[model samples]
Target: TCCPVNWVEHERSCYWFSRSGKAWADADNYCRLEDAHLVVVTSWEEQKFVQHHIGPVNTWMGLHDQNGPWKWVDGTDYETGFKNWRPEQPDDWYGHGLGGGEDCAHFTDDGRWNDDVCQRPYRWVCETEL
Candidate 1:
């Protein structure tokens, strides 16, 4: 089956890259409303697919270190799925861009992940029925 509206299909899943900005929780809620969730990048191929779709800009991902223990919205305990960070990132820059404690995670167009404040509003992607 084809993806809905603006969603794109890949492998066994359908994705929707948001143009609107929202807090991470808000975005995740939006996805859940449609039976979807923030993307869970479990492999290089999957990350690359997401990367090729999004250009160079910070986009929210499902992973976050809010409670010191990194977790995904999909309820999967983040083990690996980890080679996406930028050079020496997750710096959780104090009082910087989104401010310290880098609880939330985002990704660049090159497919690298970075930690930032979850309070920051950003465009997000959603995946479903995988």
Candidate 2:
């Protein structure tokens, strides 16, 4: 017995959309324990594909600039098939006026990207090997 067996396969990986709830770090750890990391999107088409399942809720991805310089936890660079963020988005960790400590990255309700604290509870998107 394990978590739900329902997962959507995209590209070379399987994605498990968490209907329950978890913090960003917790969700990342969960995916890692399953031999996968958070979803690392490389294109707008792929992002749209993911949005189909993710709905209007904001969800965490593998991208973050917490340690200085945006990067994927899997060590993928931002230049390898990356999509352009909405104008005036990201806001870094300080521009948002949230005190400039947010390190986690999440897809916005409108399919844009934003940063937030990792401890905030929200539905998470996870990835796993096929």
Candidate 3:
């Protein structure tokens, strides 16, 4: 099967809205353990699909700031994947409960993204392959 029964398929990928929390790195590894990776959002349509499933939860996306923006943990280059950063973000906010640097990316209740510490936990979304 291209996906597990509960996973929703859109475009070429199958997505899962995991019902548990994990640090971004742990979530990424969980997806890998399940033969997937954290979700890589491109078009607004895909974002909408994810948001529909996520409801009011803040969930991790695959984008992370390594040296600069436009980094995808699973994808090859930035151009093909593109970006949809929330305004004034990567603000690179440093403090307030963050374990270290705000490098990981997670979507807000409204589908906007904020940079977060990789050490914090959240419900995560994953994208799977056949």
Candidate 4:
């Protein structure tokens, strides 16, 4: 399959990294509007490809717990999936004062994973079928 305009192709998917910082929900919404979904990493290669194009700020991923269990926007299974969360991360630190703990996942500068407050504004990545 081919990628859409301005989106990069990788394997069976296309990826678009946003320049604007947006809250997790907004980022997700934006992705949906683009006929895509925030990136759902399912493998080390995909994770590496995503990070290779990461911009300045932390980038939002599609994994979140705003519903019940931590799930992917594309409905990828969380259990038995490839995960690269940093050590001690997803600690659900409550100091952000955003009311609730971190439920959104993002990529750190070094390409490691971290769970942060869903409302924090950050750049995001979107993925779609290629």
- Which candidate number maximizes lDDT? 4
Q: Scored by CA lDDT, what does every candidate get? A: 0.83, 0.77, 0.82, 0.89
Which candidate would rank higher by lDDT, 3 or 4? 4
Sort by TM-score, top down from the best: 4, 1, 3, 2
What's each prediction's TM-score?
A: 0.88, 0.83, 0.87, 0.94
2 against 4, candidate with superior lDDT: 4
lDDT of 1 by residue, 44-126 (tens): 88898898888887899888887778888888768755457889977877767444577888996567998877888889999
- Residue-wise C-alpha lDDT for candidate 4, range 28-52, written one tens digit per residue: 9999998999999999999888888
- The regions of model 2 sitting more than 4 angstroms off are 1-4, 93-99
The lDDT of model 1 is 0.83
Which pairs clash in model 3?
Answer: none
Clash pairs, model 4 backbone = none
Which structure among the candidates has the greatest TM-score?
4
Cand. 4 Cα-lDDT: 0.89
lDDT of 3 by residue, 1-130 (tens): 6678899888878998989899888998898998888998878898888989999888998888757765887764756765666898777777665445688899987788888777878999989755
Model 4 Cα displacement at 14 (Å)?
0.8
lDDT preference between candidates 1 and 2, better one: 1
